[PDB]
């Protein structure tokens, strides 16, 4: 009846119905189980918690993320989350509506295949379709030409599109993402005597990151400033009422995106992979890509990250070239919005993979790209 | 003149001079104060006792450990212990010799900074240097490649090194250590009617642990054996002449290292953190690390812990991979020995941090790592 969109990205689940201007259900992709003691199976206890439930009671739960780097590692829990969505968050019967899923580019084929198996077995989804997150982001911007940097929690990727023609040869991917930034921050907080080691504690660190970190325009000078007595330090109140002070970690953390070597990776910085991706593309495209850098995803939510990238690319690119970073107020939901749009299109309709076809043709069908 | 080494780990102080094949002064990191009554200040009494003094008279003393989890919490007492060392145990003038200190990785920066302040203020140490315990352990083995599991009383840590190049991105740390094992044992002895609650009583439990506990190869089957009437029970004579019988606690205690959940921790077992650390490292290193697992520290002194770990890793690692656990007769002093070696090296000499530099550059210098 009404196609629905499920941006079940690696870390945060954003679901809703096509046509709506915002997701209806947004909650963490977390499954939590009782840590300290087994469950009183003959009494009023609960084996596991999902999303906000788990987060709320995380003090006694071990939290897991079914999805890592855009790859589903725990199918039992993944299934459970989808269940939770349909019956607790949206509270609709899944067999009544088409399902548009999202996926990071360059995954094991089995990832996609297994998802569709579930959707046509555990659930009885009429028809479904799996789309690339960056592509959808571009639809949300409404631009036909550009290059998209979608960087979520589990994965970062980069997809150039020119005049409505995807360029499936310069798609790049890093497993460097928000999850690693969280972990890194968590680690360096040790320097100030702040120890966070449990999974629940990790969750706290995530919150801190989201509220205090920002992207330094000039990292080295920012460090010098932080070294001197300054106003860069901020306070933060922990759940138990304690107050902590964050100093130069407020930018030493997000900086990692521009210098992956901080965590032992050979990857070029995101400003370099953007540039390089453009260099891999035909010289007659390059100019248009430079003026249309579209950022999306939660890790682009840091204050000043656009300005930093503006600067970084400017340096790498030709002096006569106009560099323009596009970074809409709603980057966080760009992909979901794109899905809403796409699902509502009249031409899109012909791409739905029906259960009928799945049953007839078989699993291989999920990799078709006729459009 | 002759550099000296002070492995002032969290729980036991091991000091001596570089070049010696063994520590010269080994005594507990304990400061004890009169419990039952205040001190007769105008008469021949003594306000506090240190190390073996305190241990010897512990029946009337409240014992404290200045260091917890590798972090100095009581500087006044810490200072006192260093005093005791230099003037009562080694009986040398500290201003005459370079001082090599040790430290667990990932501490609050202030820990290190404050120690050096003291060394260049309360004492007048010519020059000093703070090194990581696991690293030094590797020097003692004399191997250039391996991964070190140093597990003391207050802290456990794991540091991989490849061909003389440290890999400062896969350093892991747990606050799970000998102190917790002691506490746990102390707790479960309650089951047999053995109550130990005072600090002095804790000390007794420590001794028991060290003499009767061993690591079961197959914990579950070991439990079954213990359940049946068996020879696993051992006797132990308490200081006052009473005799106690220890049964399955002889392995339910050290087992905690392989199953941290026993004490409410989310930490993976030490065999899992070893494995995982290796997985975090580059695939072309992994093989060499597997054949060079170096264990050190007092908590690796349990009978059969190497065999247990051999088994555990074997299961986790590939079937074609050769797993080799290295566990020298002298694990207990590995770090100190490593310090002896390092301090005596001709290239090492250039890393000493002089008082001059401290005064000029300031406290920040203690985190340099030029080598």
């Amino acid at each position: 009846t009404t196609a629905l969109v499920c941006d079940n990205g690696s870390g945060l689940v954003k679901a809703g119905f096509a046509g709506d201007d915002a997701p209806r259900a947004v909650f963490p992709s977390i499954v939590g189980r009782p840590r300290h003691q087994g469950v009183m199976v003959g009494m009023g206890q609960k084996d596991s918690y999902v999303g906000d439930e788990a987060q709320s009671k995380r003090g006694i739960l071990t939290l897991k993320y079914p999805i890592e780097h855009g790859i589903i590692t725990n199918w039992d829990d993944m299934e459970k989350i989808w269940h939770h969505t349909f019956y607790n968050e949206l509270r609709v019967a899944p067999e009544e509506h088409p399902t548009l899923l999202t996926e990071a580019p360059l995954n094991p084929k089995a990832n996609r295949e297994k998802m569709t198996q579930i959707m046509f077995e555990t659930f009885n989804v009429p028809a479904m379709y799996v789309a690339i997150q960056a592509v959808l982001s571009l639809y949300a911007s409404g631009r036909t030409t550009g290059i998209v940097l979608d960087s979520g929690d589990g994965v970062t990727h980069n997809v150039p599109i020119y005049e409505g023609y995807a360029l499936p040869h310069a798609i790049m991917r890093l497993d460097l993402a928000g999850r690693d930034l969280t972990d890194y921050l968590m680690k360096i907080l040790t320097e100030r005597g702040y120890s966070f080691v449990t999974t629940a504690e990790r969750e706290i660190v995530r919150d801190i990151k989201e509220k205090l970190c920002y992207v330094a325009l000039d990292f080295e000078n920012e460090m010098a400033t932080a070294a001197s007595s300054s106003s860069l330090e901020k306070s933060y109140e922990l759940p138990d009422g304690q107050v902590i002070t964050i100093g130069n970690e407020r930018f030493r953390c997000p900086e990692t995106l521009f210098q992956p070597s901080f965590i032992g990776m050979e990857s070029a910085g995101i400003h370099e992979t953007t540039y390089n991706s453009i260099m891999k593309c035909d010289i007659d495209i390059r100019k248009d890509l430079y003026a249309n850098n579209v950022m999306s995803g939660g890790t682009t939510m840091y204050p000043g990250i656009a300005d930093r990238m503006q600067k970084e690319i400017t340096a790498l690119a030709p002096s006569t070239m106009k560099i323009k970073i596009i970074a809409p107020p709603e980057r966080k939901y760009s992909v979901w919005i794109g899905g809403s749009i796409l699902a509502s299109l009249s031409t899109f309709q012909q791409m739905w993979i029906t259960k009928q076809e799945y049953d007839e043709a078989g699993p291989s069908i999920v990799h078709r790209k006729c459009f | 003149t002759t550099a000296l080494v002070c492995d002032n780990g969290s729980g036991l102080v091991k000091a001596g001079f570089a070049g010696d094949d063994a520590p010269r002064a080994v005594f507990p990191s304990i400061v004890g104060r009169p419990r039952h009554q205040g001190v007769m200040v105008g008469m021949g009494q003594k306000d506090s006792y240190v190390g073996d003094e305190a241990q010897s008279k512990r029946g009337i003393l409240t014992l404290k450990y200045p260091i917890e989890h590798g972090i100095i919490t009581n500087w006044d007492d810490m200072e006192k212990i260093w005093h005791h060392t230099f003037y009562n145990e080694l009986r040398v003038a500290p201003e005459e010799h370079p001082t090599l200190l040790t430290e667990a990785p990932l501490n609050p920066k202030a820990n290190r900074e404050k120690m050096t302040q003291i060394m260049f203020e309360t004492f007048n140490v010519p020059a000093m240097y703070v090194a990581i315990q696991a690293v030094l352990s590797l020097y003692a083995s004399g191997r250039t490649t391996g991964i070190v599991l140093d597990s003391g009383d207050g802290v456990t840590h794991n540091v991989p090194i490849y061909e003389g190049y440290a890999l400062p991105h896969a350093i892991m740390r747990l606050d799970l250590a000998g102190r917790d094992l002691t506490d746990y044992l102390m707790k479960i002895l309650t089951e047999r009617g053995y109550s130990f609650v005072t600090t002095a009583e804790r000390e007794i439990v420590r001794d028991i642990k060290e003499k009767l506990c061993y690591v079961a190869l197959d914990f579950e089957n070991e439990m079954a054996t213990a359940a049946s009437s068996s020879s696993l029970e051992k006797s132990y004579e308490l200081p006052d002449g009473q005799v106690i019988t220890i049964g399955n606690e002889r392995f339910r205690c050290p087992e905690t290292l392989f199953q941290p959940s026993f004490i409410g921790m989310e930490s993976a077992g030490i065999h899992e953190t070893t494995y995982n650390s290796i997985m975090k490292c580059d695939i072309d290193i992994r093989k060499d690390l597997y054949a060079n697992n170096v264990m050190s520290g007092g908590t690796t002194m349990y009978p059969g812990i190497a065999d247990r770990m051999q088994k555990e890793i074997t299961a986790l690692a590939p079937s074609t991979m050769k797993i080799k656990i290295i566990a020298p007769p002298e694990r207990k002093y590995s770090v100190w020995i490593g310090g002896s070696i390092l301090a005596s090296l001709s290239t090492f000499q250039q890393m000493w941090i002089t008082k001059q530099e401290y005064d000029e550059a300031g406290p920040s210098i203690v985190h340099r790592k030029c080598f």
């Binding site: 100030r192 005597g193 702040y194 120890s195 966070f196 080691v197 504690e201 922990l238 304690q242 902590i244 | 917890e68 989890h69 590798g70 972090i71 919490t73 609050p108 606050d175």
Partner: peptide
């Protein structure tokens, strides 16, 4: 420690 754990 200051936050998390005691030390």
């Amino acid at each position: 420690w200051x936050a998390x754990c005691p030390a």
